Amino acid sequence: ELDIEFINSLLTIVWRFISENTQEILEFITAAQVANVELTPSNIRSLCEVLVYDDKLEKVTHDCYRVTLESILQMIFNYFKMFPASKHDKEVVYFDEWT
Amino acid sequence: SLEQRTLNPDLFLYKELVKAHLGERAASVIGMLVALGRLSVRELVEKIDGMDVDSVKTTLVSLTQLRCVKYLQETAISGKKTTYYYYNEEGIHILLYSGLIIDEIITQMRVNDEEEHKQLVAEIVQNVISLGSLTVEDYLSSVTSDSMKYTISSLFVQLCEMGYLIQISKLHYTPIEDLWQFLYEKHYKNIPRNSPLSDLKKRSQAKMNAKTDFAKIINKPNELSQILTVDPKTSLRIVKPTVSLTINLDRFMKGRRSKQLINLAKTRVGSVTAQVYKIALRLTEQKSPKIRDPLTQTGLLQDLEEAKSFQDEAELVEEKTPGLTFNAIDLARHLPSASLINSHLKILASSNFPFLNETKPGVYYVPYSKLMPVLKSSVYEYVIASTLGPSAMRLSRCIRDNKLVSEKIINSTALMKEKDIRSTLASLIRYNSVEIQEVPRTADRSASRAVFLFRCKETHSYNFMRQNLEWNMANLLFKKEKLKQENSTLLKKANRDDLLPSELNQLKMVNERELNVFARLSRLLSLWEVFQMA
Amino acid sequence: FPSIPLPINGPITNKERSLAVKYINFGKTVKDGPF
What we know:
part of a larger assembly; 3 chains; B: mainly alpha; two-stranded antiparallel sheet; two-stranded antiparallel ribbon; 26 helices; globular; C: mainly alpha; 43% helix; elongated; DNA-directed RNA polymerase III subunit RPC6 (chain A); DNA-directed RNA polymerase III subunit RPC7 (chain C); single-stranded DNA binding (chain B); transcription (chain B)
């Protein structure tokens, strides 16, 4: 809504809400001392399209939303627990330096 | 290393494969065939310098035996027969994957355990093609006369009838375009003059028949009714001993794509259903549709009314093939419960990735032609999220589904601050995952009075990502042999004995460090081969 | 001098440490063979 940050401080709330398993999404936000001033389903859909792009949730049946099980990645496609050597090592692979 | 990183295409990959494990004299000839296309021996010697005419033929028979080139003959009316020689792109990929087939026999032949040919069945693949071609008499006449090789000879019909041991022919050692022409000219001489009507259809009358010849003549190696000998003595069934056979890349490549796609399951579900999906996957590998599609290689892919038919009937091939549409009943005996067989498979259709989605009720099957386009875009977007910021994963998905985004709707659709989106989008023009589309609102296309639009352009982003990895495979291959040039005087001493107690340090720390390279190459090769399902 | 590495940077696992042995003796067969 407002252009300055703390947008994502509420998007962690909706993602913890669904991980246990769109009109119902409104009334969970009204409680729990949420620092809010105006809610509407037009906004919350635009608030929901953010995590569609991060693949933290999924869009099914045109209004329903499931978790993509990135909670198990939250806790080869396994991009943490791959720590580099990076020190005194010459034969390492870089993504740049071919352009 | 700026001398390397600039003026080296995939020619830098194909030059140093033969340079690694073969002599230097053949790295100069196959470097010339790729750089020039095709040329016969009468003008090959003019291009290279330092190789005699019969020394080319001695050099050319080396990569002949390992199937690293492909020949052609076309005569002239006035002249003699000219032997045009081409380059083989699939014969040298065998030399690339060569460490991985040894571990592909093991992960696919799992009926046996604690066998005394584990050291031998790992060697038969090293025996079949490191010699070049292979025939049956070459291993039975070895240093051992009997050695219970009647078990070993009957072991190979278990290992040939499961695939990738097809008898070689002139089909595998000629390319695909120089076969299609003279049969299209044979089918044109099959139908003569004496019909004037619809001559454009008469020119295509050979073309409808040459399609039926094309899929026929490529099954002649695949057809298994003439590759083994029924013999009523001392055995039951055995391969014909007079057969010259090598390995085949396709069922390895189809098995690798199937190995590539089960890893998408372990992400979209846990490990119970990931264990379920392996069994129905592995059983359809011996007869799966073709990955490389020799239909679509070279021919009438130009016009859409023919280019539609390259997947119209091909999807009808996949839908109306009997030997893969499993009943969903016989899966319980293969797993070491027709409720849980259907229930753990019911979540496959419910997930929005179309594997085990479209079917007939009761008999379900995994489609291919509308699946692997979704695998390639899923693996590529995670590479961007892995090596650079997660903001780019948000932006690249945003411009994907939202067609032709501008810079105002990009802050309506996504939510980031304005200063941070420049520091993430400008990393995507440099690597071509986004593009620019311009509208000149003034005269003569002036830039300050103009606004800019974006696009995905879902082919240019995958070509650049392909060749961003074909170089990195070969650059790691460049530091393979160049590491073995220093510390070479004791690599000869390590090869003349089959002991200075301080010199041995300078042989292990160079050998443990090159142990990392083959593991780093295998992971990148898994990252590269996804972009070959064209 | 260049930044931004690929994420394939791991100390080698013995699941694929045997896989790297099959490469070095493959070329040792072919180079010390006929060619």
